[PDB]
């Protein structure tokens, strides 16, 4: 499913992400936009053979099992396939563990490069929230 901006902001808010570990809603929406263009079915393979999945492009080396990443750790206890669903619950729950892992949102390269330090509040402007 391809989310609209306000629609995604509203789902992420409901799922407890606004200000989770100090990151305002706008940070999460911005990350999604640049990681996946708001498409839950986005997948991308990395050179190391791991794959990034879903709206938040969570990586198969540490976070989910895809059965093809030798020595993955499966930290979120979930098949990577679950991160592609139209329901973002599994994606959000895993993201909460990643952001809590010690580097905050810097775990998301597109956040660090394209969101961090920008006016992220622009991503939830106009939304009914």
């Amino acid at each position: 499913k391809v989310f609209g901006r306000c629609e995604l902001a509203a789902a992420m808010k409901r799922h407890g992400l606004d200000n989770y570990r100090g990151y305002s809603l706008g940070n999460w929406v911005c990350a999604a936009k640049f990681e996946s263009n708001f498409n839950t079915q986005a997948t991308n393979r990395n050179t190391d053979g791991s794959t990034d999945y879903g709206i938040l492009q969570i990586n198969s080396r540490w976070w989910c099992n895809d059965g093809r990443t030798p020595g993955s750790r499966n930290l979120c206890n979930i098949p990577c396939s679950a991160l592609l669903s139209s329901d973002i619950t599994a994606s959000v729950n895993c993201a909460k563990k990643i952001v809590s892992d010690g580097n905050g949102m810097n775990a998301w390269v597109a956040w660090r490069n394209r969101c961090k330090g920008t006016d992220v509040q622009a991503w939830i402007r106009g939304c009914r929230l």
Side-chain angles (χ1 to χ4, degrees), residues 45-102:
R45 187 80 149 280
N46 314 128
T47 69
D48 66 351
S50 57
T51 301
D52 295 335
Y53 291 87
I55 201 105
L56 283 173
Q57 291 291 271
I58 295 171
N59 185 265
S60 74
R61 194 53 106 297
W62 316 96
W63 305 102
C64 64
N65 174 70
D66 67 3
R68 56 156 202 212
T69 321
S72 156
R73 237 255 157 195
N74 196 15
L75 252 15
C76 300
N77 207 35
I78 207 71
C80 296
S81 64
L83 306 181
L84 299 192
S85 167
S86 50
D87 180 330
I88 59 151
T89 303
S91 268
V92 168
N93 293 176
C94 189
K96 287 169 168 170
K97 239 110 59 178
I98 304 162
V99 77
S100 293
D101 206 49

Side-chain angles (χ1 to χ4, degrees), residues 3 5 19 25 91 105 120:
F3 276 84
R5 172 180 73 81
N19 292 134
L25 230 218
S91 268
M105 289 202 70
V120 288

Side-chain angles (χ1 to χ4, degrees), residues 1 6 14 19-20 23-24 29 31 40 42 47-48 50 56 59 72 78-79 91 99-100 103 112 114 120-121 129:
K1 170 188 180 192
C6 290
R14 178 197 154 213
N19 292 134
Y20 190 84
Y23 288 93
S24 72
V29 174
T40 66
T47 69
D48 66 351
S50 57
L56 283 173
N59 185 265
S72 156
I78 207 71
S91 268
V99 77
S100 293
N103 309 271
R112 314 195 258 98
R114 304 193 75 178
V120 288
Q121 247 200 108
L129 19 127

Side-chain angles (χ1 to χ4, degrees), residues 6-21:
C6 290
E7 176 186 22
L8 181 76
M12 279 174 157
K13 204 209 170 107
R14 178 197 154 213
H15 271 104
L17 286 178
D18 184 23
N19 292 134
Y20 190 84
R21 299 276 186 290

